[model samples]
Target: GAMDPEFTIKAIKARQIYDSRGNPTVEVDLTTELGLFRAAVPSGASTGVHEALELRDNDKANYHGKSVLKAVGHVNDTLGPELIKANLDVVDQASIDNFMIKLDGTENKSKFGANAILGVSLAVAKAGAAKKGVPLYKHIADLAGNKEIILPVPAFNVINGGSHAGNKLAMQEFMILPTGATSFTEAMKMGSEVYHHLKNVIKAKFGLDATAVGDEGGFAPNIQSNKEALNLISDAIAKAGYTGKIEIGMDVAASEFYKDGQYDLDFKNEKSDKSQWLPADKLANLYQEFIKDFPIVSIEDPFDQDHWEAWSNLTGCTDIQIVGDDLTVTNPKRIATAVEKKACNCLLLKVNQIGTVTESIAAHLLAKKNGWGTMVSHRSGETEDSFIGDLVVGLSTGQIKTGAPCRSERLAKYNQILRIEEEIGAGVKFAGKSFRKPQ
Candidate 1:
């Protein structure tokens, strides 16, 4: 596959960035053997297909960074128009419009999807550049360059909620700095200060506080543990001084609990079947215990979506919002089912899961319309794409879940949001610290 250029693009697994906070971010890398040119078009980052699209049979396009953005645009733009044409309310379109208007201004008239913007942005830029006899790359770069984009802050506040809660929750607080910034030196001198300003503004206006917040960083197996195993986590959070503010967290994939006997054995290192099933009663007890002390604010896949009775009961007992990820895979119908079952009070919106950012946002709107809190998240396997950070701030959803803060990709998102809040002035608050203190 490496020998053929076509396989090169396929080899380009998407990259999400991370910083010291362990948050995953997105970016474009053309130099790597990943074999994909990167671009960030003016649109959302996601596609609508339930499955990833097979790369164009043989286009040099490869995994153009903007492809994901364009794909997202296509889904948002196309789906909404289709739904509206059919006389549907097109909630997704309305939400996208509301959001876009806030950022780009109503005069922009940007459509609801990435494809629409990609085509338009590129066409206009290309036409003017062509008339001037400039190279397309230069034209594209000129058009795409120099603007500070706003994204969502990825904070997984619930990973630390269970009996094993601790600093393990801080991993997702990483940042995605603006395009020009890199490294801790640059981050601290240039980025960190920017974040401080944003934090202050968000605090004063929107009442977001970042000090106590812990972010969701690292993968599940790495962070999730039995109660006795959480000592290290507790220490880490304490050491970081993340107690009531922002906290560390995780994304427990559905398979972690439900599938039981039919379990796909690859995830667990053990050869035994007994270890896989945390019986309904036992699972309930575990959750019950976690909520007693930990400041866990969110939980994804607390129980298999199908276990309605357990899920319903679990939701009633905790102040921590129960989020639906694997249970709904960001699909509206599935979310509707979970809602009907009273399985959870929150939803995690994933563009790829439902096949597009537009669709994901639609699900987000559904949650909002229902008064359910929503979070945009990254998949276990992620790339250094930081656009989602802007979505978080732009849409004002208030939560995100990437990975730990060790990577530059993740940090980029965190940093980007801080900058946005600074520019927007004191309405947005940092995650973790953004909540009202418990009385």
Candidate 2:
């Protein structure tokens, strides 16, 4: 009892918690002599199908068939005890993650939910940091083999449309990235202040009802054209006096409205019928138009996941960030395929998509070795947990897409970033203008 059990896990408990979407998800409580380390799993609204499986209790009445108690049970009934029984060192992130990965005993880790595995996986990292008396980002860098810590430029997705909101616009996320800020503190002002100016601009031009809060804290409205939304953001950037200091990025894709052989975009007026019958070229042409007119630096999943032809062509012609999200799904095979075809130059890294942090680290490094810009991302259905904030710092990925600076769920990640910049105030490098390849 005299010696501390600093590196040893004492108890692993899991329970159900509500996410930003008011849906049920798993949150794990991992205890060591140092303290309790908790990790909450996030939920995404996409079926990228490439993502590790999340167990859901599909009963008719439980959370509208969205319950995750079975996932919680896997932790309480299975993984928690197995993890404790081994007496493994929490500092061994790879070993802890892999040991649990194997215990699940399936290629897809179907025996235990990926949510269950990831909950434990993230908890172990937090515990590892606790045991080592370092910040979580430091432990992550140790595991990640990253020699540097770079604070990422926050890609604040401040305007929302598509299915994320009940609005009429078809494009999902229109974002702002502050690349001119020399420090992360300066970056926050652009994000928060641009947000304020953005809201005021939209409210002034489109009226009060148009300033509705989106699923990810972005302003949502039934804007007539996606182009109109871009204009709104452009006007706000000018109003905030950061026209060139900040740039625009968009998250658009066939994922939102591409179906059959035609595109179903909500441009001007009502949803169009087969007369317009827009094809992939029309979509690419539209993006070309947007890039010409605005300070658009990044365009994510511009085409459908399988539309390699359009992806490569768009990426080939543009000297901007071409992100693979639904396209890559953070899967190595897809990532390799995209690299081979020159489909995209960036990876939208999501921890849940690939399951364990160990796997995501491998994927991140894999993308890095190939000269790809890796962006740490957040699921729309997030929680107060800010694991990815530490994660973005450690990976040195140079960019984070954690929604806007509005709701606490969104602000939780941003505020933790402030704490990190304060902690490492002395020689920290903000990704800033070189966010894509923060050299």
TM-score of every prediction relative to native: 0.54, 0.95
Tens digit per residue, CA lDDT, model 2, 1-439: 4554443688889999999989898999999888899999999975667778888888888678899999999999989988887789889998888899899988667789889999999999999998889999999999988888999999998888777666667888899999888899999998899999988988887798887786688898667678888988888889999889998889985666777855778543354666665688887888899999999999998888888998999898889999999999888989999999999999999899878999999999888899999999999799999999999998889999998998888889989988999999789789988899975
Each prediction's RMSD to truth: 14.0, 2.4
> How high is the CA lDDT of each candidate model?
0.42, 0.88
**In model 1, what lDDT does residue 25 have?**
30
For model 2, what is the error of residue 107's alpha carbon versus the real structure, in angstroms, after optimal superposition?
A: 2.1
Colliding pairs, model 2: none
Candidate 1 residues 23-89, lDDT tens each?
2233222222322334232211233333223111122364332223433433334532332233312
